[PDB]
Design a protein around this nucleic acid. Sequence first.
DNA 1: ATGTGAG
DNA 2: ACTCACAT
Length: 326
Amino acid sequence: ETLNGGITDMLVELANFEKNVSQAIHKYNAYRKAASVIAKYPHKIKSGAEAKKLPGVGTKIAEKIDEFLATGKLRKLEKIRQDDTSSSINFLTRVTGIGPSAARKLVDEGIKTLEDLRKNEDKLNHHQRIGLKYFEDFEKRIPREEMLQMQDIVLNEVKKLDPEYIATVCGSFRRGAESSGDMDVLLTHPNFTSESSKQPKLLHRVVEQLQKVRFITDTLSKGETKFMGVCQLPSENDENEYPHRRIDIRLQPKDQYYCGVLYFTGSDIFNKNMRAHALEKGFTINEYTIRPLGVTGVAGEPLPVDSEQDIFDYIQWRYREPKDRS
DNA sequence: ATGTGAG
DNA sequence: ACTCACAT
Ligand SMILES: Cc1cn([C@H]2CC[C@@H](COP(=O)(O)OP(=O)(O)OP(=O)(O)O)O2)c(=O)[nH]c1=O
Ligand code: NA
Ligand code: NA
Ligand code: NA
Ligand code: NA
């Protein structure tokens, strides 16, 4: 969050390459944690060996910083930005279902764009094919006026099915965001607690129903606990049609509701801060259970929770309500 | 079982 | 950080 942006920019882009184009995940981590250290740094960096004093920045990662701070930018990130392969892997990556490995494989075979893909759906698995089919609007985001409209359609249909069901919309929404990427529903039913076995049925029935009233149109994956698929708000009579959205429905044990609604309402970075900044206090927060991390690596028997706050006050952390979670 | 993808 | 689902 400091006036060291440029430095951490090129650092982040340099990893988004080792991820997408190179083999390396460890190079991807090293470059990212380096971005992290420099971001929190109080001062403005004017040397390469000054950033090096930090843990995570080291010889080759600090040589490059000298370049950035000596001559404009970096040569490596120019050969990359001006490569056909790299740019195309990065493009393909943008369909859900495709990431690094498959893009590599596709670009190796001269497949590089939407038109390229549509003529080549044979190569894609089912997930990817729906990501394709709905590429345009999957990158579009969702207004609230329209977001609520779906909530009043999931809350209303899930209750008509069986009034014991509880649906709480999470992610961005709970954080108050004016715009969301994709719909996130945590589902809870009394019949299902942590001690009880499975009940895929409890999920699959609100799914199968949401399909019947034609609000869910596709499925990416559907299991015991989790459904990932595609929704779309009702075409208010012909043509002016709303775009297709992504939607998750997770089925949470009723007794571990609080832990679960914590895990959702992100961000994913807030979940990684809070989780890491717990393992110093020797705890292992889940989406299910907070629990002491004993002597060796043995994770002790859970921990009572009747509110998020309790998780918060377990790990000796200030409380931050859903809207300050990032 | 593992790798991959999404979360 | 830590899980879940898919496809070998
Ligand atoms: C990706 C990811 C997510 N989570 C949790 C935390 C949030 C929920 C849903 O997050 P989402 O990606 O939709 O974020 P959302 O807030 O909905 O952002 P958009 O509005 O979709 O952009 O998942 C996580 O723990 N680790 C992860 O790596
Ligand atoms: Na993708
Ligand atoms: Na979301
Ligand atoms: Na999601
Ligand atoms: Na943790």
